[PDB]
Write an enzyme that holds these catalytic residues in place. Structure first.
Site, PDB file in Angstrom:
ATOM      1  N   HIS A 107      -3.749-104.354 -61.041  1.00 27.80           N
ATOM      2  CA  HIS A 107      -4.325-103.593 -62.250  1.00 27.80           C
ATOM      3  C   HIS A 107      -3.684-104.056 -63.764  1.00 27.80           C
ATOM      4  CE1 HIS A 107      -6.196-100.414 -64.564  1.00 27.80           C
ATOM      5  NE2 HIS A 107      -5.190 -99.874 -64.851  1.00 27.80           N
ATOM      6  N   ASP A 131      -8.931 -96.716 -63.199  1.00 26.24           N
ATOM      7  CA  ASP A 131      -8.271 -96.031 -63.849  1.00 26.24           C
ATOM      8  C   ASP A 131      -8.877 -95.379 -65.008  1.00 26.24           C
ATOM      9  OD1 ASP A 131      -5.134 -95.403 -63.673  1.00 26.24           O
ATOM     10  OD2 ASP A 131      -4.857 -96.951 -65.580  1.00 26.24           O
ATOM     11  N   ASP A 186      -3.547-103.976 -67.603  1.00 24.51           N
ATOM     12  CA  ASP A 186      -4.006-103.182 -68.806  1.00 24.51           C
ATOM     13  C   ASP A 186      -3.660-104.124 -69.894  1.00 24.51           C
ATOM     14  OD1 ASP A 186      -4.044-100.496 -67.802  1.00 24.51           O
ATOM     15  OD2 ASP A 186      -1.805-100.330 -67.670  1.00 24.51           O
TER      16      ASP A 186
HETATM   17  C1  LIG Z   1       2.543 -91.061 -63.011  1.00 19.42           C
HETATM   18  C2  LIG Z   1       3.154 -92.428 -62.743  1.00 19.42           C
HETATM   19  C3  LIG Z   1       3.537 -93.216 -63.607  1.00 19.42           C
HETATM   20  C4  LIG Z   1       2.893 -94.655 -63.712  1.00 19.42           C
HETATM   21  C5  LIG Z   1       3.700 -95.734 -63.145  1.00 19.42           C
HETATM   22  C6  LIG Z   1       3.060 -97.075 -63.597  1.00 19.42           C
HETATM   23  C7  LIG Z   1       1.810 -96.922 -64.432  1.00 19.42           C
HETATM   24  C8  LIG Z   1       0.529 -96.658 -63.846  1.00 19.42           C
HETATM   25  N1  LIG Z   1      -0.590 -97.229 -64.414  1.00 19.42           N
HETATM   26  C9  LIG Z   1      -0.638 -96.820 -65.808  1.00 19.42           C
HETATM   27  C10 LIG Z   1      -0.580 -95.574 -66.074  1.00 19.42           C
HETATM   28  C11 LIG Z   1      -1.190 -94.713 -67.102  1.00 19.42           C
HETATM   29  C12 LIG Z   1      -0.943 -93.051 -67.148  1.00 19.42           C
HETATM   30  O1  LIG Z   1      -0.327 -92.675 -66.131  1.00 19.42           O
HETATM   31  C13 LIG Z   1      -2.310 -95.408 -67.732  1.00 19.42           C
HETATM   32  O2  LIG Z   1      -2.169 -95.018 -69.082  1.00 19.42           O
HETATM   33  C14 LIG Z   1      -2.458 -97.069 -67.596  1.00 19.42           C
HETATM   34  O3  LIG Z   1      -3.504 -97.431 -68.075  1.00 19.42           O
HETATM   35  C15 LIG Z   1      -2.090 -97.344 -66.065  1.00 19.42           C
HETATM   36  O4  LIG Z   1      -2.410 -98.604 -65.815  1.00 19.42           O
HETATM   37 ZN   LIG Z   2      -4.503 -98.631 -66.827  1.00 16.45          ZN
END
Ligand SMILES: CCCCCCCCN[C@@H]1C=C(CO)[C@@H](O)[C@H](O)[C@H]1O
Ligand SMILES: [Zn+2]
Ligand SMILES: *[C@@H]1O[C@H](CO)[C@@H](O)[C@H](O)[C@H]1NC(C)=O
Length: 1016
Positions: free
Chosen positions: A61, A175, A63
């Protein structure tokens, strides 16, 4: 021939509003599957004749901006993941990988030498690397306009068709924070056969899993027949990460994420690490994993199992590719060769998964449920509802809608001609489309990125806006100059754009003043563009250096005008008031422009030395205690003063509006004889909780219902004119303006939340409409969906996206509020509507952003407010899940999203000027739009091709005969047509060769694309 979208309630197995009404939402501990239950299976279900077929699908993934900018992520992470993907897939023929984000893939592929380009094409061609969705990004689904979801999808898929020779038919959306039926709508009309989603409320995952309804044919809410349907797979668990994708137990699944052994700085928070698979442990490890797989398989209907394998920016290190691949190959070899498991597991792609599911369906092994509705508002746990991001960073949410329209206008204006390569039209349009497409990312428009990343997106969009202006002003100059006199320099500014509402007043003194004088320049040409395919009138305003200005058209017919002062508002830190200052050196002229369908019209502003015959002057009244004088340079009418008092206003035949002594609407009277219907504007604030979870960029966690903003004794400015009147009031954090031009009023709020930490400012309407618990909000500017306020859910769960409009109604009366920007909103009590303006949050909300929202800046929000009688309208029945706008409400929305464009001629004299373009364009029925007009070929192409996207909405029939219009055939808009084809909406595949080179119009709620071909 057209389905009726109002009178037949579709029969579906799962209707999400119905399901919401019945479901419990209790948040109970389900054990290792915290939000489900302990899954049980019959070990004899799978046997030698009926094996479980498992596809392990590696993914990463990425971003396109979030905690780093696009370029920072690309340099630090994504270039390495793609480079190593190319090498490891090339070297390992059975390994597979899916890729979603084409913005990154295009950034990479053009840095590649030809040898690596050929290597990359061969791994795509052979099916090892497979693109999923193929959009420039994985867009937000809440705030995004459908038009920009299509733009970005098209941008990515056109790149993939051209450079990879592939077009995905399976979508991957793991996501976005909640899901919209706009996605299957667009995908099914763009050749797609399957889609996958993930972020749905934990209670809905539980409810659907129990009934094995996680795979469903998702049709639009009004679709009786089912022709919109798209097969959809909803993932069952909390996350798309590896702990939440092998099975119900993340403590077990985390042991099969081989990147978590220590050297990569990742571990398992359930405290059992992964172990390298060896001959001594493989049987034990396989037993553990297959058991997880068979439990996950119980939630689905076929004997084919999807196991995603990946997480954020995974598959970076070479050592990571090796550790994942070699360990999984050992598990596969043992499992597949042990008959007692009755499993055949292998790496696979998303398309391979869907193909196998449908083979099982065809073999009569399963039939799938039908479903309609949406998946808002998302909660990932407890009462943590993700309604905050419907409003976060609202300056950029508004900038999205501005750039949306400027992209459409630039592509349409320049589409009429083929341009020399030296004009750089294609270059500028591609940059604009790409920066707008990038911002559709689920951390872009959502306002969930770090402060410096939001700055990156804004800079990119500003450059996009500049590129659109360059294209538009060059196009106007060509369209309106006698051809034998037309003499372009492709770098010159012939016109500059004048935009009254962006960045808007108090946000930026961006607006040029037209400088006229007897001793310098007597007159100035201005041009309006109308991107809509129908004749349109709209008042337009310009700034001018004298109040003594009159307007003519290009036949030198006088045009009625109104001059008002230029008022700006100031927080006077001297007197501690917010009050208006009048310009002494500039004035505003206002007049009605009339513009052909998809066309242009020219007017001339000329100075005189006294009041011109056809120009009137507004009167101005400043209501406040302790007034001081307000001189207006030359303005011919003295300002008047009074203590605060109720006032009422009426422009033309329009409604009559009454206002409280604090300058806020109190009532609307539709007609001379009709009642004064109570309609009260009020501003309130939400706070943040002092213990427990804190609101942040994603989460809205209010400390109770909102409390009224204390207004004190605000200063109210009343401007009254024959063409336009308004009431403006300086409130704490908001300059609130109600503008009247003779129909539904326009509302403008200059929102500056200042340093008010932990505050969310809401604008509420209070009415007597007996709406109960029902209200309607839109999805992506495409459709209106019925909402039911549920007291079993907390306040923040009853918040929904307001991407473009919302309404409430009873048997007799409706109030619709249309917006120029996506914000969050709700109806928290019968007769109310409310919509959040901005939010400033001092704390992080524990979703990885690592900051609150403390970078607010002044934003000008715009709206239209339409009060209507609806007892005569033919509405859907009580059980129907959709609602529809009236003609007035639809036109009001169009005035906000796609206003006339204004151009001011930049030099003293425009030789060869013409009065109009597009006078012979068909004026199409009001419910039809040309959403996109795009020339698809460069000038060297022998056969020119022009793409059009046609969208027809559905308007309520309320008994206005309203008839006679011209059929619009887009294929005959340009001359020398040689072919007309219906295409997918991305224009990439031909679906029908059309008789007579005629593009038929589309049915209500349908969207079609056509491409006309022209010998050149
Ligand atoms: C709740 C766990 C924290 C996240 C750890 C790593 C990132 C996980 N993934 C991210 C997370 C978020 C919001 O939680 C989004 O805004 C991103 O687009 C996504 O890629
Ligand atoms: Zn994301
Ligand atoms: C593009 O894909 C098609 C499948 O439709 C294939 O037949 C064709 O060879 C491809 N073109 C190239 C350049 O390989």
């Amino acid at each position: 021939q057209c389905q009726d979208v109002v009178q037949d309630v579709p029969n579906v197995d799962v209707q999400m509003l119905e399901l919401y009404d019945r479901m419990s939402f209790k948040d109970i501990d389900g054990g290792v599957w915290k939000q489900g239950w302990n899954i049980k299976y019959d070990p004899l279900k799978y046997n030698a004749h009926h094996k479980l077929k498992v596809f392990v699908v590696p993914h990463s993934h990425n971003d396109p901006g979030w905690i780093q900018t696009f370029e920072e992520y690309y340099q630090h992470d994504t270039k390495h993941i793609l480079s190593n993907a190319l090498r490891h897939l090339h070297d390992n023929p059975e390994m597979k990988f899916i890729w979603a984000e084409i913005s990154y893939f295009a950034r990479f592929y053009h840095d590649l030498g030809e040898n690596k380009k050929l290597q990359m094409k061969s791994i795509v061609k052979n099916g090892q690397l497979e693109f999923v969705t193929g959009g420039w990004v994985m867009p937000d689904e809440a705030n995004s306009h459908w038009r920009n979801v299509l733009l970005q999808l098209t941008e990515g898929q056109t790149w993939l068709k051209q450079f990879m020779n592939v077009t995905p038919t399976a979508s991957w959306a793991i996501d976005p924070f909640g899901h919209s039926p706009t996605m299957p709508y667009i995908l099914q009309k763009s050749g797609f056969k399957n889609m996958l989603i993930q972020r749905t409320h934990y209670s809905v995952k539980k409810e659907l899993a129990q009934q094995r309804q996680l795979e469903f044919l998702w049709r639009q809410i009004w679709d009786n027949k089912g022709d919109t349907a798209l097969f959809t797979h909803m993932m069952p668990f909390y996350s798309y990460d590896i702990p939440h994708t092998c099975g119900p137990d993340p403590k077990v699944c985390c042991q099969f994420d081989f990147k978590r052994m220590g050297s990569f700085g990742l571990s398992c928070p359930w405290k059992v690490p992964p172990r390298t698979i060896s001959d001594q442990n493989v049987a034990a490890r396989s037993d553990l994993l297959v058991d997880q797989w068979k439990k996950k398989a119980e939630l689905y209907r076929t004997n084919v199992l999807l196991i995603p394998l990946g997480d954020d920016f995974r598959f970076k290190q070479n050592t990571e590719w090796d550790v994942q691949r070699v360990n999984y190959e050992r598990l596969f070899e043992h499992i597949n060769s042990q008959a007692h498991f009755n499993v055949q597991a292998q790496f696979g792609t998303l398309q391979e998964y869907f193909d196998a599911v449908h083979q099982a369906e065809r073999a009569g092994q399963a039939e799938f449920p039908t479903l309609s509705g949406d998946f808002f508002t998302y909660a990932d746990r407890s009462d943590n509802y993700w309604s905050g991001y419907y409003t976060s960073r609202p300056y950029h949410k508004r900038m999205d809608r501005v750039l949306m329209h400027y992209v459409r206008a630039a592509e349409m204006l320049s589409a009429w001609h083929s341009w020399d390569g030296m004009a750089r039209i294609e270059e500028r349009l591609e940059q604009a489309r790409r920066e707008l497409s990038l911002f559709q990312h689920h951390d872009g428009i959502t306002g969930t990125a770090k402060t410096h990343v939001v700055v990156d997106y804004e800079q990119r969009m500003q450059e996009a806006l500049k590129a659109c202006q360059m294209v538009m002003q060059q196009s106007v100059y060509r369209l309106l100059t006698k051809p034998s006199i037309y003499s372009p320099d492709f770098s010159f500014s012939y016109f500059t754009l004048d935009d009254s509402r962006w960045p808007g007043s108090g946000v930026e003194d961006s607006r040029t003043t037209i400088i006229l004088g007897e001793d310098i320049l007597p007159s100035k040409h201005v041009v309006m563009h109308n991107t809509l395919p129908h004749w349109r009138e709209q008042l337009v305003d310009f700034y001018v250096s004298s109040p003594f200005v009159s307007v003519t058209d290009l036949a030198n017919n006088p045009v009625e005008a109104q001059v008002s002062p230029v008022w700006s508002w100031h927080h006077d830190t001297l007197t501690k008031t917010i009050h208006p200052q009048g310009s002494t050196t500039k004035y505003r002229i206002i007049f009605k422009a009339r513009v052909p369908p998809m066309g242009l019209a020219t007017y001339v502003l000329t100075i005189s030395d006294s009041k011109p015959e056809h120009t009137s002057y507004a009167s101005n009244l400043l209501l406040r205690k302790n007034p001081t004088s307000l001189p207006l340079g030359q303005y011919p009418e003295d300002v008047k003063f009074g203590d605060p008092r109720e006032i009422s206003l009426r422009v033309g035949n329009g409604p009559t509006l009454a206002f409280s002594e604090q300058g806020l609407l109190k009532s609307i009277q539709l007609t001379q004889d009709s009642p004064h219907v109570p309609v009260h504007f009020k501003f309130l604030k939400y706070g943040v909780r002092s213990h427990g979870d804190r609101s942040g960029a994603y989460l809205f966690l209010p400390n109770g219902p909102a409390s009224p903003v204390e207004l004190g004794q605000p200063v109210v400015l009343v401007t009254k004119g024959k063409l336009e009147s308004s009431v403006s009031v300086g409130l704490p954090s908001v300059v609130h303006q109600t503008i009247m031009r003779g129909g539904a009023p326009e509302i403008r709020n200059l929102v500056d939340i200042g340093s008010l930490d932990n505050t969310e400012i809401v604008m509420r309407l209070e009415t007597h409409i007996d709406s109960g618990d029902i209200f309607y909000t839109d999805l992506n500017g495409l459709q209106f969906i019925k909402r039911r306020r549920l007291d079993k859910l907390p306040l923040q769960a009853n918040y929904y996206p307001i991407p473009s409009g919302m309404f409430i109604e009873d048997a007799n009366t409706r109030l619709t509020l249309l917006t120029g920007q996506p914000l969050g909103g709700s109806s928290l009590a019968s007769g109310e509507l409310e919509i959040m303006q901005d939010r400033r949050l001092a704390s992080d909300d524990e979703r990885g952003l690592g900051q609150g929202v403390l970078d607010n800046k002044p934003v000008l929000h715009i709206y239209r407010l339409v009060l209507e009688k609806v007892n005569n309208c033919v509405r859907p029945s009580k059980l129907h899940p959709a609602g529809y706008l009236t003609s007035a409400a639809h036109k009001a929305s169009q005035s906000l999203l796609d206003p006339l464009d204004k151009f001011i001629f930049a030099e003293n004299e425009w030789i060869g000027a013409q009065g109009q373009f597009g006078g012979d364009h068909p004026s199409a029925r009001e419910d039809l739009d040309v959403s996109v007009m795009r020339r698809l070929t460069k000038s060297s192409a022998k056969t020119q091709r022009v793409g059009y996207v046609l969208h027809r909405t559905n308007l309520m029939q309320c008994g206005t005969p309203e008839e006679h219009t011209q059929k619009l055939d887009v294929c005959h808009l340009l001359p020398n047509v040689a072919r007309c084809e219906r295409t997918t909406l991305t224009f990439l595949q031909n679906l029908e060769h059309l008789d007579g080179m005629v593009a038929p119009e589309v049915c209500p709620m349908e969207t079609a694309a056509y491409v006309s071909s022209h010998s050149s």
